[PDB]
Write a protein that binds this DNA or RNA. Structure first.
Lengths: 111, 111
DNA sequence: TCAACTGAAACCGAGAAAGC
DNA sequence: AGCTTTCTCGGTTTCAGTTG
């Protein structure tokens, strides 16, 4: 399973604005989640994390495949949904604000 | 897939005035479609089918959610649009009359 | 004026399928 | 094999834009 450490690395990297830890224990984080239809939407910035997952897993090849941010978003979402390593704290997510984000908890390796 | 048999059941039920079959083969039907801004509009009657779909899918809970007929209508419209089981006969729909309705064909499961 | 309405497209959870 | 990520499906939600 690559998702757990890859995502932890992405947050720890500080390369994705808004992809940040919410506590110092590094067990809860925010992941920017902007709807791709908004005017506010900028693919280069708002799709960067989804694309990186597609690039990292080889499901998209720069220069060869047509860019498809909607598909990229679905892949990371479904991976998070089915992952036993991550749990959305849905009551804490902020999808209705100008810079929307979902909140995820990282499950301890024992549960 | 729940919409096809659910809607057939609603028509067959006869509980929704104006929600009726257009032939005896039960392959074409009418769905009352009154604009919610009209004075003629009665929520309890004109939104009953839309509400029933929202209740059936758990998208509206009495005691939890505020009544919102426009959302109920949008939900059923978009589902009909996207479903391969139903096709609007737009030339037969009557949106310009005092009791407006849309006409739908039910596509055979073989197509 | 603005609530309701719209097609199109983006989005969604879940189970099957695919992949390690 | 058993685990993790992806594909498929049947709707749902949101978008800019229109309508009554």
């Amino acid at each position: 399973g690559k998702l757990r450490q890859w995502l932890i690395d992405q947050i720890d990297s500080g390369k994705y604005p808004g992809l940040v830890w919410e506590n110092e224990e590094k067990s809860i984080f925010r992941i920017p989640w902007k709807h791709a239809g908004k005017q506010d939407y900028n693919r280069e910035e708002d799709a960067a994390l989804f694309k990186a997952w597609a690039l990292f897993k080889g499901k998209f090849r720069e220069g060869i495949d047509k860019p498809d941010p909607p598909t990229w978003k679905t892949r990371l979402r479904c991976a998070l949904n089915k992952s036993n390593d991550f749990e959305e704290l849905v009551e804490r997510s902020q999808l209705d604000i100008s810079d929307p984000y979902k909140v995820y908890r990282i499950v301890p390796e024992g549960a």
